[PDB]
Amino acid sequence: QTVARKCSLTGKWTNDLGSNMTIGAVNSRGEFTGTYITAVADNPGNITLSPLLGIQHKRASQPTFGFTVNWKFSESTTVFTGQCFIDRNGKEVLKTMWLLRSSVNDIGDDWKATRVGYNIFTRLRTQKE
């Protein structure tokens, strides 16, 4: 639609689940920092931006990436792992997965303390004139 074939996470994105994610600038190493907002929770009492850290590729046309999200209002951590593609028409999307980790009190309960899921993000409304 405007680009021919290029993906960069720097900017902002929004997910079909309602979650939003914002990324400033990725370092030459490939690491990056960000701010992540969730619209759905197991206990939504005080959802805040969860700081994120991780790494992305920028060699391929549509590379893989991944990052941790460290919660603020409840002790937990969630990693995300996926790829950014370009549909037929020159439209950009992120097809990713996630993994949530509960904060148990015994090693005998680690088994239930894990949770996997899926997520799809897209470029937030850039609008036009």
Add this chain to the structure above:
Amino acid sequence: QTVARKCSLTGKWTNDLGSNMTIGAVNSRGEFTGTYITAVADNPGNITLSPLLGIQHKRASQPTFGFTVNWKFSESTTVFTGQCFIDRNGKEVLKTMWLLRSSVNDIGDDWKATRVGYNIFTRLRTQKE
């Protein structure tokens, strides 16, 4: 006292699968950087240290953590998510999971491009019992 009710990732660990991980120092934000070595691969032709980045907790006795590992010898990314516990006797272990992301060329193949797994790390050479 040391070794009894306190987990810090700073130092070195070793995994039952053969993989080793080394972490320098975790920042006051809770983020950290590191060097990760794998002993098993889908294509082991030139395994190197894969730079890692992420975040850990240090509030609880046995908190949750998580981090990305960005590959060098093949384009991929793998996140890790788990908790560090203290067994009955006062021994420290890491019970974690992982998630690998393949670098596809079409959005119609993202489905197979994900892979989940499990991993267990321990303190590399402590004392005895």
Add this chain to the structure above:
Amino acid sequence: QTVARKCSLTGKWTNDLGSNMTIGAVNSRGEFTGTYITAVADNPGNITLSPLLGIQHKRASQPTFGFTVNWKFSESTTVFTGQCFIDRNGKEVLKTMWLLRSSVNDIGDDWKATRVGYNIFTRLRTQKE
């Protein structure tokens, strides 16, 4: 009416990935048998119906289910686990996950031999509502 606050797997479904599934009749125990067709594979040389066996609930309004799919043209097994919901308007969907198991030759490679994913199915041949 047949449609209204009620989901039953017996009949046929189709997935957004292009895969299709057909289920005859579920037993009073809750077990059921079926025929499953995949449109995407790691090696698509001779895709056939993969026999399926498993169990479903029919107590709730939109219950959970799950089943194994035993491959024919390549030795593997894949389980599916999800729930059948009813959107706002009264429409039925299946939001499920899957898990694929490769047929390794050593216990030292079980780690890579697992694969998780997501899938969404709907009623094949729907009307306007």
Add this chain to the structure above:
Amino acid sequence: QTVARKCSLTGKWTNDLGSNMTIGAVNSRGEFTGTYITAVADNPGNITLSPLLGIQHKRASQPTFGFTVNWKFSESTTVFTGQCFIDRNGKEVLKTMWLLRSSVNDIGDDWKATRVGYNIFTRLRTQKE
């Protein structure tokens, strides 16, 4: 005991988590039925045998398998997917994974309603030659 290159699930097994599983006889199609007992739960108020159903391979030396477990004391379903191996010495083990599915009330909560994990089973107390 008289196996060192042959796996059959028919009999009984025990898991490192404390869960036990029992399987009668696998049908020539490759399907089977069984009784599964859990030692750990998210709400252990009345753990019972959960009926299981699924399919296994018996072509390879150490094949893959998989099956559903339909809960009795709480509405849920859990599939298992793994492989049975033979360690160096001629000892049999099952390295598998699991996936749990919660029984949500809205399609907007399917995201948290999934849970993945790992499990390892071994032959229960075998008799001598």
